[PDB]
Design a protein around this ligand. Structure first.
Ligand SMILES: Nc1ncnc2c1ncn2[C@@H]1O[C@H](COP(=O)(O)OP(=O)(O)NP(=O)(O)O)[C@@H](O)[C@H]1O
Ligand SMILES: [Mn+2]
Length: 439
């Protein structure tokens, strides 16, 4: 009603399962179409976008790939894209439309590109150019781990194995229904999934990189356990009876004591918002009344040292605005770290390189910023090899060595050390491909 008025930013914070995605958003879109508004819908991931455009099956929805920088048809159409696609387009295009209504679904997503998107959108709204709707059961500052739900949930607090077990946890395997198990890391998930698989359990693993291909498999009944990272907090719909949640995550932190680096701290306790979102995967079905949330430990609200707050600013400082509008993070997320105006603004080829390192090289934001602001070209991989001794990367205790594009053998020893590029087997493989200049 007033939600369509420019300069309004609405936080739709109805409880998990309430129907924000599948009933309320469709209504908003049908009404936006009636008012002839230029509408953008943002989904956390590709497969969720795919689920969104079936809830909107009657309507003129156009999914937008990030392989395309802009797509203007000149017709009445509603654009649908991932959070990251939007921020990627803002970094590389000028022809980003003046959407006057922007809905972010699952607006609790704390991935840097999502935080950056919210910052951008809030500013567009404040300019009087747009109205905006952020949809999430857990907006910034959320502290209630046990929000209301469609059907009753049994909250069971008990010990949960961190790794492979052999005895003392019969309740895990004797349970008769389907379970979603949130683990802090891919390695932790690998361990757990293999322990369950030896007992004859069918397991699907989910992480950020495999979500788009693995998540669809969970839509079948041909499984017993899902073992997932925090990616499933973003609007993932499961038909399950139980969540297991030791409430642990890894958190990237930029250390500034001496040589600046990114570590993965933890496992540490999750935020209340994360715990609520994990719990909120169950109790979704009014017909199904004895869902369980099995958990361990209390949340920790203070995530102020999380790298993602800085990284969002790095992105935002490089998305262009009129003069003199200053880029800024949205709402209370603005208060996570100290803002410094223009701190991360890059110019010329340094900026182009920054974007390319993230897009083409699939490098973390901080790492890309570090390389780009040193005046290093995208294709110049020498920095992968010229780090200090403590930056030597190890795989199975042994020193990782790389055959380079030019037919040279070099020890993998990056000048800037970001723990995320070797945090797991797939991450390390990718970084090895990058260091060898095969992308
Ligand atoms: N594909 C589906 N088929 C049948 N029911 C579904 C399907 N997807 C979702 N649901 C149910 O539809 C109801 C509302 O879903 P939804 O619109 O995603 O709620 P929500 O508010 O977006 N949840 P959340 O994002 O966790 O806060 C829930 O009971 C879901 O379990
Ligand atoms: Mn939702």
């Amino acid at each position: 009603e007033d939600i369509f008025r420019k300069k309004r930013l609405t936080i739709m914070d109805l409880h998990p399962g309430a129907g924000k995605t599948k009933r309320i958003l469709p209504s908003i879109v049908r009404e936006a179409l009636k008012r002839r508004l230029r509408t953008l819908i943002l989904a956390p991931t590709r497969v969720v976008a795919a689920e969104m455009e079936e809830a909107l099956r009657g309507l003129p929805i156009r999914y937008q790939t990030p392989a395309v920088k802009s797509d203007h048809t000149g017709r009445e159409i509603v654009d649908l894209m991932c959070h990251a696609t939007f921020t990627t387009r803002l970094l590389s295009s000028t022809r980003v439309p003046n959407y006057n209504l922007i809905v972010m679904d699952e607006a609790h997503f704390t991935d840097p590109c999502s935080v950056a998107a919210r910052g951008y959108i809030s500013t567009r709204v404040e300019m009087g150019e747009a109205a905006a709707i952020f949809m999430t059961a857990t907006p910034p500052g959320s502290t209630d781990p046990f929000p209301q739900s469609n059907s009753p949930i049994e909250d069971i607090e008990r010990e949960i194995p961190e790794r492979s077990w052999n005895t003392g946890f019969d309740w895990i395997t004797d349970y008769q229904g389907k379970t979603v198990w949130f683990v802090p890391s891919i390695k932790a998930g690998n361990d757990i999934a293999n322990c369950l698989r030896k007992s004859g359990k069918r397991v699907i693993q989910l992480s950020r990189k495999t979500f788009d291909t693995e998540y669809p498999k969970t839509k079948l009944t041909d499984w017993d356990f899902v073992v997932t990272t925090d990616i499933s907090e973003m609007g993932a719909n499961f038909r399950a009876g139980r969540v297991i949640d030791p409430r642990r995550c890894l958190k990237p932190v930029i250390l500034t004591d001496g040589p600046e680096r990114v570590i993965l701290a933890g496992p540490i306790p999750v935020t209340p918002a994360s715990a609520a979102q994990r719990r909120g995967r169950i109790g979704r079905n009014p017909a199904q009344e004895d869902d369980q949330y099995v958990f361990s430990g209390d949340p920790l609200r203070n995530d102020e040292d999380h790298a993602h707050w800085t990284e969002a600013k790095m992105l935002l400082d490089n998305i262009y605005t009129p003069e003199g509008i200053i880029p800024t993070l949205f709402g209370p997320e603005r208060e996570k770290t100290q803002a410094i105006d223009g701190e991360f603004r890059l110019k010329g080829e340094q900026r182009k390189t920054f974007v390319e390192l993230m897009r083409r090289g699939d490098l973390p934001v901080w790492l890309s910023y570090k390389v780009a602001s040193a005046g290093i070209s995208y294709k110049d991989r020498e920095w992968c090899f010229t780090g200090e001794r403590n930056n030597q990367i190890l795989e199975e205790n042994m020193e990782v060595e790389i055959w380079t594009r030019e037919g040279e053998k070099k020890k993998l020893r990056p000048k800037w050390l970001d723990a995320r590029v070797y945090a797991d087997p797939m991450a390390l493989k990718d970084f090895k491909e990058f260091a060898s200049g095969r992308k």
